[PDB]
C-alpha cells in the first residue's frame, strides 16, 4: 500500500499508493515496497510534487481532453500560495510533473507561468526586445526607427 519515489539525488520518499497514482507514469509502472527511479528531479522538487499530491488526494480535475474546462480552470488558492517559489524551481516543478505525467500539476503549475508572461509591464517588454536575436540589426534599426516618434 506504499510506493517509493527515488529522486535524482538518491533520497527515498515513501508515498501512499492511492495518493501516488496521481502520476500516470507510476500508476502504469505498478502493472509489474515498489521502488522506482525519478532520475532528473531533485529531492526538494519531488517533495513539493508529493505534497501537492497529498493535498489533491480527493480533488476532481478535468478529463485531460477538455476545450474550456482545462484552459479556463482557475488555480486553487493552495495552488497559488503553493507556487510562490523561485522561478527556476517552479520550472523544475513543471519538469517533474511532465516526467511523472501529472497533468493537473502540469496544469496548475503552468497557468502561473502563463499569468507571468502576460500581466507584465510594457516598459520591460520594450526593454526585453532582442535578448534572443530573432531580428537582423537592419530590422532592429527599422523597428526602433518606426516607433521613435513616441519617445
Amino acid at each position: 500500500s506504499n510506493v517509493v519515489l527515488v529522486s535524482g539525488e538518491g533520497e527515498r520518499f515513501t508515498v501512499d499508493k492511492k495518493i501516488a497514482e496521481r502520476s500516470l507514469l507510476l500508476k502504469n509502472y505498478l502493472n509489474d515496497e515498489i521502488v522506482m527511479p525519478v532520475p532528473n528531479v531533485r529531492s526538494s522538487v519531488l517533495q513539493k510534487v508529493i505534497e501537492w499530491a497529498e493535498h489533491h488526494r480527493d480533488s476532481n480535475f478535468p478529463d485531460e481532453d477538455d476545450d474550456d474546462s482545462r484552459k479556463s480552470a482557475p488555480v486553487d488558492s493552495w495552488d497559488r500560495e503553493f507556487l510562490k517559489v523561485d522561478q527556476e524551481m517552479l520550472y523544475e516543478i513543471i519538469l517533474a510533473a511532465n516526467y511523472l505525467n501529472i497533468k493537473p500539476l502540469l496544469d496548475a503549475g503552468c497557468k502561473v507561468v502563463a499569468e507571468m508572461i502576460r500581466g507584465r509591464s510594457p516598459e520591460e517588454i520594450r526593454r526585453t526586445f532582442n535578448i534572443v536575436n530573432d531580428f537582423t540589426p537592419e530590422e532592429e534599426a527599422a523597428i526602433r526607427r518606426e516607433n521613435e516618434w513616441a519617445e
Binding site: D32, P39, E64, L95, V132, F135, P137
Partner: protein, 579 residues
C-alpha cells in the same frame, strides 16, 4: 550520418550568407561560414561566442538511426532471405517422406496433451483465430478417426492442417520440462541422424516446431488450397504466425499472407457489425470473421516490407480508410495497439519528421490503452488471462518506447532520453518477471524478439556516441537479458547477439580514430560503416538481380579512412545476419 547541426539555431539566415546570396546552414555560427573560417564574423549579433560544448553530429545521427533501424533490425535481420535458385533443391519427393515421419511421430494422447496445454495456457493466441478450442477437440477426434483412411475430402484436410498448426503453436510455446514428459527424443534422433546428446533445450524443440509447421503447410498443399479458398487457411496461418515461422520462412509467409488476403477479401464482407436482416448463424459468422480480420491485420502489418507489396491494413487510429471504430473492443485492442505502432514506424524509411500533434495524440491513446488494459478481468484460475495481460502490456510498453524514442530523435523534448531508459527498464522488468516458474514461456512470443531487437540496437547505437552511466547500466542489463532470452528463437537470437557485438566493436572503433571536422559536416570511419550497412542490405533486398537471372541466360555485369572501413567490414561483416 554527418552534418554540423549544433544546439541554439539562429532564427534568420546570417548576414554573410545574405551578402553572398547562397543557402544558409542556419546554425550558430553556421556550417557555411565555419567552413571558410569566418567564425568570429558571424557570432557578433548578441551575447556572442556562446559555448557549443556539445557533440554536434548527434541530431543528424539519430535521424540516421531512424533509417538504420528500418534497414537492419526490421528488414535485414528478419525479413531478408538470400536465396540462389540455382543451388536450392526442389522436389516433392522430399516432403512426402519427411512430413510423413512427423505425422506418424505424433501419437494420439500426445496430441491431446498438446491440446490441453493450448486450452490451459495459450488462450490469448488461438481465440482470435479459431475461437473456443472445445469445438476443436472434436476435430482432433475426427483426425484420429480419419487417420487410417485413403480418400480424404478437402474439408477434412483443412481441419487437419488447422490442428497441425495448433500443434505447432503448442510445440513452440511448451516449456522443456512439460515437453520432455510428453515426447521421447531418441526415435527422432534415429530419423534425423545427429548427435545423441542434443536434448530439447539444446535446440531440438525448434526443429520439431519447424517441421510441424512444414507438416501443416504440407496438409494445406494436400488441400490444394489455391483452388479452394477457405477461412480455415486464414485460421491456420494466423495460428502459424504466433511462432517464428514468419522469420524462418519470411518469403513463404508473405505468399501465404497474400493468399490469406485473397481468401479473406473473397468473402466481400467489409462491415462485421451484424445487421438486422441476418440469419442468427450469419451474425455469429460475421463476428468471428471480424475477429479474424483484425488478427489478420496485426499479422499483416508485422510482415510489412519490400518483399510484401499487397497489404490489408487500410484504417487509421488517429486524426480513404474503411473499417475502423465500428467494432467492439475485445480483440481490436491488439490491433488498436499495433495501428498505434504503425503510425510511429511509418516514419522510419520516410524522410520527413512526424508532426508533434500526432505524437501527442499517440501519447493520449497510450494513456487510454494503459487504463483499458488495467480494466481487464483477472481470472486467477486461468493461466491465459495473465498471458493476454502480458501481451497487451508488452505491446503498450513497446509503443511507449518507440514514441519516446521518436521524441528523442526528431524533437529532443523534456527528458525523452530518460523516458527511453524508463520504458526500456519497463520492457526488461516485464521480461525478467517471466523468469519465474509457470510463466517462462511468455518470453517466446515474437513481439519480444522484435522489441528486444529494437531496444538493444538503439541502446548499443546510443552507447557508441554518448558516454553516459544510466545508458551503460541499461546496456549491461539488456546484454544479460539477451543472454537470457529463450533458445527457441535460435539463429535470430545469435544474430542479435552478433549485431550487439558489432555495435560494441564499433564503439571501440569510435574511441580510437579521431573525428575529422570539416566545418559543415564530420567524418569518421564509424559513420561510413553505418552508411554502408544500409547500402549492403538494400542491395540484398533489390530483386533486379533475381529478375535478370530469371529472364534467361542474362548475367549482371555489376584515403586513410578507407583502410579502416574495409578492415572492419572484412572483420565484422553486416551480411552475417542474413544466412
Amino acid at each position: 550520418m554527418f552534418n554540423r547541426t549544433t544546439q541554439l539555431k539562429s532564427k534568420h539566415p546570417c548576414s554573410v550568407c545574405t551578402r553572398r546570396k547562397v543557402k544558409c546552414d542556419r546554425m550558430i555560427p553556421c556550417g557555411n561560414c565555419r567552413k571558410r573560417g569566418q567564425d568570429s564574423e558571424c557570432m557578433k549579433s548578441t551575447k556572442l561566442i556562446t559555448a557549443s560544448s556539445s557533440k554536434e553530429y548527434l541530431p543528424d545521427l539519430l535521424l540516421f538511426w531512424q533509417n538504420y533501424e528500418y534497414w537492419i533490425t526490421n528488414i535485414g535481420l528478419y525479413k531478408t532471405k538470400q536465396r540462389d535458385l540455382t543451388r536450392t533443391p526442389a522436389n516433392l519427393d522430399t516432403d512426402t517422406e519427411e512430413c510423413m515421419f512427423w505425422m506418424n511421430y505424433l501419437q494420439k494422447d500426445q496430441s491431446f496433451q498438446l491440446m490441453n496445454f493450448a486450452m490451459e495456457n495459450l488462450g490469448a493466441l488461438y481465440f482470435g483465430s479459431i475461437g473456443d478450442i472445445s469445438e476443436l477437440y472434436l476435430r482432433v477426434e475426427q483426425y484420429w478417426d480419419r487417420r487410417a483412411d485413403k480418400n480424404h475430402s478437402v474439408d477434412g484436410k483443412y481441419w487437419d492442417a488447422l490442428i497441425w498448426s495448433v500443434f505447432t503453436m503448442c510445440i513452440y510455446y511448451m516449456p522443456v520440462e512439460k515437453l520432455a514428459e510428453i515426447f521421447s527424443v531418441y526415435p527422432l534422433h534415429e530419423y534425423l541422424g545427429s548427435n545423441k546428446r542434443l536434448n530439447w533445450e539444446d535446440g531440438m524443440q525448434l526443429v520439431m516446431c519447424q517441421n510441424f509447421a512444414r507438416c501443416s503447410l504440407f496438409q494445406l498443399k494436400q488441400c490444394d488450397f489455391m483452388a479452394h479458398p477457405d477461412i480455415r487457411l486464414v485460421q491456420a496461418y494466423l495460428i502459424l504466425a504466433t511462432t517464428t515461422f514468419p522469420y524462418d520462412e519470411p518469403l513463404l509467409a508473405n505468399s501465404l499472407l497474400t493468399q490469406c488476403i485473397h481468401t479473406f477479401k473473397n468473402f466481400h464482407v467489409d462491415d462485421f457489425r451484424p445487421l438486422l436482416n441476418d440469419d442468427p448463424v450469419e451474425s455469429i459468422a460475421k463476428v468471428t470473421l471480424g475477429r479474424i480480420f483484425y488478427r489478420l491485420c496485426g499479422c499483416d502489418y508485422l510482415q510489412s516490407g519490400p518483399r510484401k507489396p499487397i497489404a490489408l491494413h487500410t484504417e487509421v487510429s488517429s486524426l480513404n480508410v474503411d473499417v475502423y471504430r465500428e467494432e467492439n473492443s475485445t480483440e481490436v485492442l491488439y490491433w488498436k495497439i499495433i495501428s498505434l505502432d504503425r503510425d510511429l514506424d511509418q516514419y522510419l524509411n520516410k524522410s520527413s519528421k512526424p508532426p508533434l500533434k500526432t505524437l501527442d495524440a499517440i501519447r493520449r491513446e497510450l494513456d487510454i490503452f494503459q487504463y483499458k488494459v488495467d480494466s481487464l478481468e483477472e481470472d486467477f484460475r486461468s493461466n491465459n488471462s495473465r498471458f493476454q495481460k502480458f501481451i497487451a502490456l508488452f505491446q503498450i510498453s513497446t509503443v511507449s518506447w518507440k514514441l519516446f524514442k521518436m521524441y528523442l530523435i526528431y524533437y529532443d523534448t523534456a527528458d525523452s532520453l530518460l523516458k527511453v531508459i524508463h520504458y526500456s527498464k519497463v520492457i526488461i522488468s516485464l521480461i525478467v518477471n517471466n523468469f519465474h516458474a509457470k510463466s517462462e514461456f511468455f518470453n517466446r512470443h515474437p513481439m519480444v524478439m522484435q522489441t528486444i531487437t529494437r531496444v538493444v540496437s538503439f541502446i548499443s547505437f546510443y552507447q557508441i556516441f554518448v558516454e553516459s552511466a544510466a545508458v551503460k547500466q541499461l546496456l549491461v542489463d539488456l546484454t544479460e537479458l539477451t543472454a537470457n532470452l529463450p533458445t527457441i528463437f535460435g539463429s535470430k537470437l545469435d544474430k542479435l547477439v552478433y549485431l550487439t557485438e558489432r555495435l560494441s566493436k564499433l564503439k571501440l572503433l569510435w574511441d580510437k580514430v579521431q573525428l575529422l571536422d570539416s566545418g559543415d559536416s564530420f567524418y569518421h570511419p564509424v559513420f561510413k560503416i553505418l552508411q554502408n550497412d544500409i547500402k549492403i542490405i538494400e542491395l540484398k533486398n533489390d530483386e533486379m538481380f533475381s529478375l535478370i537471372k530469371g529472364l534467361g541466360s542474362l548475367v549482371p555485369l555489376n584515403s586513410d579512412f578507407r583502410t579502416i572501413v574495409e578492415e572492419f567490414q572484412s572483420e565484422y561483416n553486416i551480411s552475417d545476419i542474413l544466412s
